[PDB]
């Protein structure tokens, strides 16, 4: 759940594109305020330092909460039994 | 006498009709210039009749910007057409409004709003519209006009603009509404919140060149009605003087320092990665990239030997962006085609090793070797020994197995023929066996036996 | 600092967050009163 | 008041209904309508209506409104809370 | 060999510092690269440079563990009179 | 999504009823449940 | 140091410590048992 000033939604959706697997599902126009409430998802392994990135990119005009009370479990891409998939030593690995 | 004037009216009336009917944003300039092929300056109302007919009948929902630009371009030099068309559009509106014809009202306001976005129309015209709209609660039109040109009112007439937004907010907050209208109101408020200028369907790009426009003002709340028969021929006094005015208006209208810097980047760098970074940080323009690669080649050739420094530099740049890759490709072509003619044997050794190295690790595609066409007359001796050192580097890196696989894949008919003349194929075989790559020749050698017997 | 560092010796805990600022400022000289519905605000469509 | 009924509030309502506890709602920080957002009072009333209607959307059968004193208005920075019953008791009951 | 590049930069700096302390002033702006690297027949000291390179930089942990590759560059010797001084290394044919 | 929330729709007949009904199980498998 | 790159301090390094990112960087038998089980 992301609360951000409305003209800065492009930054928030750009961040949600930069992080892997994250998606935005709904935007609530918070009535009588300059804020939007943006509801989405991000994987937990991808969630490290999400709050810090969002707060810095929005210059403190945005904030977010991360929670797991709706217990969503999702398939990781690729096959576990794929013996010869490419895995880098230091860069984050490709999707497949 | 008068029949000649009537014919002069009707020839315009026929001539303009494709010039008007084809109006789309690709051709507003073309239609603008073409309309001055005939004396519209005397035949003024002809275009105005077509505009009112067009807006009423023809459902031009995405095409109205081009019309709005065209009238702006006409008002730029012959403002009588603006002066009239203000009235013509306002009278079109009030009639179609009374006929409850929402679609044509949409067309007429989409025009008038863009005509106020341009400086063709005075703000009182839009405010006389907005008066009419709010006194009959035709809000869905108010959304259109406010979206297209509301910010212009915010600058020109802020004191009333606050009252328009106040009533719209009251409506959205307090009244039961159709969901289409409600969504339109919400998007309008979003536009005011985020980027108020974003209603610009109208091509404000024309403003620097169309700067001679000027606004016209009218009041439609007086007891006027549309003079709908004004499009037909009406007699003209001072016809020849006005013709000369029209014709006169028409005839009025109708190197070393860069090389030094690049060289000093190369000579300041320990590693080819450092050299590549130092060059990529300069943000060299696309027309200069080819000259940079020429400098990299020439500097590499002034050295006593080949060096992996120039390979690494070239690879890092080739993979950074596609423009560098294209530059390197056309530099390989330029080298072989033009300037190997005047390079000595050792420099050709360096060139061969350099390009063969870049080809081995696939930074240059194997297809680039198609420029080489290998016959005694089609090739030259310097070129032949260049090919020798290139293929030698290829064999040293890849080995003959991988090399032969790639050469089979890449269809290099220019130097590995099969269907050519027997002398041609024989020459290719003699070259490749002479440089020591005879095992590659076996296929075309076998085919040579077939074509001979 | 205590999550992302292995040996955070002598660090001090930072202040986490403040609620997001929504202080509207009156831009205009005279024509805008003290209390007004600023253009930045979302409307209130419920009825 | 500002962010109002967010998704976190939705889940808190749902968990309260699950746990079989009596809900009561404090609408806090009313100064932020007056001083921060600078809403005129009619728009502030509409804002509070939007908030209370959103509360009622998730409290399944039970109805929340101030005249039932299940809603409390507050500004805990400026040191006050009130209900309709409290205000009429202090400043109108003596005059009718 | 990055430790050698670090030692080279320090050594050239100290060699220049011997000259500077001969003139009782370490101040950079007095002594541009033209003073040191101009050849002798033009009145310079005729020093040969290896220290005006960029030094490869990398994450220390990742470099201890594996070949990180050159991800970043440190500045070597720098002067406000920014000049692209050539290196000794670019004029010696490598042993291979 | 239902069992994530510790809900269905531990008595055997009740459980088998809702397995047969909402989750569309065969009666055989519906009665043959041995643990969740 | 920033993002794990750079010197401990510019002091004592004989450099400015400036850092910049490098732009150069037919079925089997056991299968039939399901068919039996059906």
Curated annotation (Swiss-Prot), chain E:
It is found in: Nucleus. It comes from the Eukaryota. Functions as a scaffold that mediates the ordered assembly of spliceosomal proteins and snRNAs. Required for association of BRR2 with the spliceosomal U5 snRNP, and the subsequent assembly of the U4/U6-U5 tri-snRNP complex. Functions as a scaffold that positions spliceosomal U2, U5 and U6 snRNAs at splice sites on pre-mRNA substrates, so that splicing can occur. Interacts with both the 5' and the 3' splice site, as well as the branch region. Has a role in branch site-3' splice site selection. Associates with the branch site-3' splice 3'-exon region. Also has a role in cell cycle. The MPN (JAB/Mov34) domain has structural similarity with deubiquitinating enzymes, but lacks the residues that would bind the catalytic metal ion. Contains a region with structural similarity to reverse transcriptase, presenting the classical thumb, fingers and palm architecture, but lacks enzyme activity, since the essential metal-binding residues are not conserved. Present with 468 molecules/cell in log phase SD medium. Component of the U4/U6-U5 tri-snRNP complex composed of the U4, U6 and U5 snRNAs and at least PRP3, PRP4, PRP6, PRP8, PRP18, PRP31, PRP38, SNU13, SNU23, SNU66, SNU114, SPP381, SMB1, SMD1, SMD2, SMD3, SMX2, SMX3, LSM2, LSM3, LSM4, LSM5, LSM6, LSM7, LSM8, BRR2 and DIB1. This is Pre-mRNA-splicing factor 8. It comes from Saccharomyces cerevisiae (strain ATCC 204508 / S288c) (Baker's yeast). The lineage of its organism: Eukaryota, Fungi, Dikarya, Ascomycota, Saccharomycotina.
């Amino acid at each position: 759940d992301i609360t951000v000033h409305a003209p800065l939604l492009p930054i928030v959706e750009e961040l949600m594109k930069k992080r892997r697997g994250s998606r935005i599902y709904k935007t609530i126009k918070v009535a009588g305020t300059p804020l939007l409430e943006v509801r989405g998802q991000v994987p937990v392994i991808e969630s490290a330092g999400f709050e810090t990135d969002l707060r810095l990119s929005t210059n403190g005009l945005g904030m977010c909460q991360l929670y797991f009370w709706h217990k969503i479990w999702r398939k990781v891409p690729g096959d576990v039994l794929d013996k010869d998939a490419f895995i880098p030593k230091l860069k984050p690995a490709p999707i497949n | 006498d008068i029949k000649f004037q009537r014919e002069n009216w009707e020839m315009i009336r026929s001539h303009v009709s494709p010039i008007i009917s084809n109006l789309t944003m690709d051709n507003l300039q073309e239609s603008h210039r073409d309309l001055f092929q005939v004396n519209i300056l005397i035949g003024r109302n002809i275009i105005c009749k077509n505009v009112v007919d067009f807006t009423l009948n023809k459902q031009n929902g995405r095409l109205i910007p081009a019309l709005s630009a065209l009238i702006a371009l006409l008002n730029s030099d012959i403002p009588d057409i603006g002066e009239t068309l203000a009235k013509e559009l306002m009278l079109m509106f009030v009639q179609q409004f009374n006929r409850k014809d929402y679609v044509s009202c949409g067309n007429i306001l989409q025009c008038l709003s863009i005509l106020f976005l341009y400086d063709v129309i005075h703000e009182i015209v839009i405010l006389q519209i907005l008066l009419l709209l709010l006194e009959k609660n035709s809000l869905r039109l108010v959304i259109a006009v406010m979206k297209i040109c509301g910010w212009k009112l915010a600058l020109v007439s802020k004191k009333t603009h606050d009252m328009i937004w106040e009533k719209l907010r009251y409506i959205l907050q307090t009244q039961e509404l159709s969901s289409t209208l409600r969504e339109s109101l919400e998007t309008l408020f979003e536009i005011r919140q985020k980027d108020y200028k974003s209603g610009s369907q109208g091509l404000f790009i024309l403003d620097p060149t169309s700067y001679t426009v000027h606004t016209h003002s009218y009041i439609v709340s007086d007891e006027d009605e549309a003079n709908k028969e004004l499009g037909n021929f009406e007699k003209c006094e001072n016809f020849n003087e006005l013709t000369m005015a029209f014709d006169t208006l028409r005839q009025k209208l109708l190197d070393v320092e860069f090389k030094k810097k690049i060289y000093l980047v190369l000579k300041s760098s320990l590693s080819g990665d450092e050299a590549a970074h130092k060059l990529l940080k300069l943000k060299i323009a696309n027309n200069l990239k080819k000259s940079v690669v020429d400098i990299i080649i020439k500097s590499s050739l002034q050295e006593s030997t080949f060096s992996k420094f120039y390979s690494i530099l070239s690879e890092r740049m080739i993979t950074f962006h596609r423009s560098w890759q294209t530059a390197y490709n056309e530099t390989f072509e330029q080298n072989y085609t033009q300037d190997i003619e005047d390079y000595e044997t050792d420099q050709l050794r360096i060139l061969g090793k350099f390009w063969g190295h870049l080809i081995s690790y696939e930074f240059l595609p194997m297809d680039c070797l198609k420029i080489i066409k290998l016959t005694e007359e089609e090739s030259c001796p310097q070129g032949r020994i260049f090919i020798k050192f290139l293929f030698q580097e290829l064999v040293n890196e890849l080995g003959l197995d991988e090399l032969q696989l790639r050469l089979n894949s890449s269809k290099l008919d220019g130097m590995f023929p099969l269907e050519g003349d027997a002398e041609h194929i024989r020459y290719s075989i003699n070259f490749f066996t002479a440089i020591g790559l005879g095992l590659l020749t076996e296929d075309m050698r076998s085919r040579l036996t077939i074509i001979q017997e | 600092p205590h999550l992302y560092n292995s040996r955070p010796r002598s660090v001090r805990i930072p202040w986490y967050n403040n609620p997001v600022s929504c202080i509207i400022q009156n831009d205009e000289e005279y024509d805008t009163p003290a209390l007004f519905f600023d253009p930045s605000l979302n409307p209130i469509p419920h009825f | 008041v500002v962010e109002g009924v967010t998704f976190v509030v939705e889940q808190l309502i749902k968990q309260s209904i699950k746990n079989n506890v009596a809900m009561c709602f404090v609408i806090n920080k009313l100064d932020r309508l007056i001083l921060d957002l600078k809403l005129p009072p009619m728009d502030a009333y509409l804002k509070l209506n939007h908030i209370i209607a959103n509360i009622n959307s998730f409290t399944k059968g039970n109805v929340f409104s101030p005249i039932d004193n299940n809603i409390i208005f507050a500004s805990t920075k400026l040191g006050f809370t009130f209900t309709i019953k409290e205000f009429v008791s202090y400043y109108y009951a003596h005059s009718i | 060999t990055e430790p050698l590049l670090d030692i080279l930069v320090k050594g050239e700096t100290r060699i220049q510092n011997r000259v500077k302390l001969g003139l009782n002033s370490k101040m950079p702006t007095r002594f541009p690269p033209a003073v040191f690297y101009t050849p002798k027949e033009l009145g310079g000291l005729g020093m040969i440079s290896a220290s005006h390179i960029l030094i490869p930089a990398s994450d220390l942990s990742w470099s201890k563990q594996t070949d990180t590759g050159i991800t970043h560059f440190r500045a070597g010797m720098t002067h406000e009179d920014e000049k692209l001084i050539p290196t000794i290394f670019r004029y010696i044919t490598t042993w291979e | 999504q239902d069992l994530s929330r510790n809900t269905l729709g531990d008595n055997p007949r009740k459980l088998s009823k809702i397995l047969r009904t909402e989750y569309g199980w065969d009666s055989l498998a519906s009665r043959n449940v041995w643990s969740f | 140091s920033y993002n794990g790159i750079g010197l401990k301090s510019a002091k004592g390094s004989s450099t400015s410590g400036h850092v910049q990112r490098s732009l150069a960087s037919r079925p089997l038998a056991v299968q039939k048992q399901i068919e039996t089980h059906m």
